[PDB]
Assembly symmetry: C2
Homo-oligomer: 243 residues x 2
């Protein structure tokens, strides 16, 4: 029986996180803390003997830079990297760019909480003529109108991520390539919801810590055997339990 190891990294604090703005597909960079966390994740992987053959990341520079920093730290900069929009963060619709506190003062704390934490209720949608509509970005020129999001719930993020796992990433894993994925909270949640068959009720409660390698050991059918976080388990638990 085969065992494959898959490693996931959620990027750390972004510039817009620090500024208390909804981000979604807005393409902001990492903050100094996010940059520090990317290097920390690389150092942990190097200390623990992790070696990779192939890396995946999103089209968003906060995840791409996380991967590049990790690879530089691991002296693995020559490795093949595949970037794809299907690993993007959940799209935040017409909330993108807005201050979270002002948005809650305007529309109500509970309504914003629903937009943030519901499985299936999306934030308000963009119109295609909005400056923020992804169809205006050259990076999304290849997307059909059905693929370009105006807003996403976690449910819709799952529907977008899982085809990429099934058609592209999983075959690479089955080939024996040791894969590292650097991506985002909701797209990594989508992946682990599929792998561990997590209920809608449980997945909305799952908080993947930032800057912490998450390792899945998968059997010959890519069914999980076990998973674990790398690092100081006391510090990891604190990262998990903070919101």
């Amino acid at each position: 029986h085969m065992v494959y190891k898959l490693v996931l990294i959620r990027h750390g604090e972004s510039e817009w996180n620090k500024e208390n703005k909804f981000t979604g597909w807005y393409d902001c960079g990492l903050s100094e803390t996010g940059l520090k966390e990317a290097k920390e994740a690389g150092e942990i992987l190097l200390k623990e003997g992790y070696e990779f053959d192939l890396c995946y990341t999103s089209f968003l520079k906060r995840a791409i830079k996380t991967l590049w920093i990790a690879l530089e730290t691991m002296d693995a900069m020559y490795l093949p990297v595949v970037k794809h929009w299907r690993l993007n963060e959940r799209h935040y619709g017409a909330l993108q760019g807005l201050n979270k506190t002002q948005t809650a003062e305007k529309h109500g704390e509970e309504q914003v909480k629903i937009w943030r934490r519901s499985y299936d209720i999306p934030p308000p949608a963009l119109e295609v003529t909005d400056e923020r509509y992804p169809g205006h970005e050259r990076k999304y020129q290849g997307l059909t109108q059905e693929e370009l999001p105006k807003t996403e719930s976690l449910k819709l993020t799952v529907d977008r991520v899982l085809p990429y796992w099934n058609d592209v990433i999983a075959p690479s894993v089955k080939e024996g390539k040791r894969v590292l994925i650097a991506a985002h909270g909701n797209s990594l949640r989508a992946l682990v919801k599929y792998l561990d068959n997590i209920s809608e009720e449980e997945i909305v409660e799952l908080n993947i810590p930032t800057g912490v390698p998450l390792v899945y050991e998968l059997d010959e059918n890519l069914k999980p055997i076990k998973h674990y976080y790398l690092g100081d388990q006391e510090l990891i638990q604190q990262k998990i339990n903070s919101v």
Copy 2:
């Protein structure tokens, strides 16, 4: 008669490396960029933005001084999402048993004249590594896909050309002909090999060609990938200053 095409290919030689600063032969030794090399990569990105260049596909080597140059350029250009292909056939010329040795030390070991022959010849390679030497690339995980014939113990410019051009013909040239706007971030001798082929440059001429670091080099290629013209981007007087003082 046939339909005219104009393809644009952009080449960037990486800037100063840490071992450049230390006056060491580098070759396939995988050293990083110096602070000046880091700055040059940003400057190249800025000029490409200023001059209106956008890209669809990037190639670089397995050596981090070139990869880092590409990554800095892409960050500067807000093009970090673009597909990147890295391949050892774009590596710098291998300098054999001189790698890591200081240039002044090497003049001691071998004499000024023999060193200049190895530096400036077309097909006289420097002393070769033994496979038991820690510097032999077979020891590196990154090269485990190479055959024994592919692992270099030393290279002349000729052997570098022999290694680069199959990659151009088999991989990069088809991408260019598909219409993908290609950016190549690489090294002095691997970019010499490409331009030797594109412009049909003699051995005598190609050894005198000094591509300036951090300066985008644009080739306009027609529908058959024959060059129409080429030019550097930036302040031409400053570029000539850099070329002249080298």
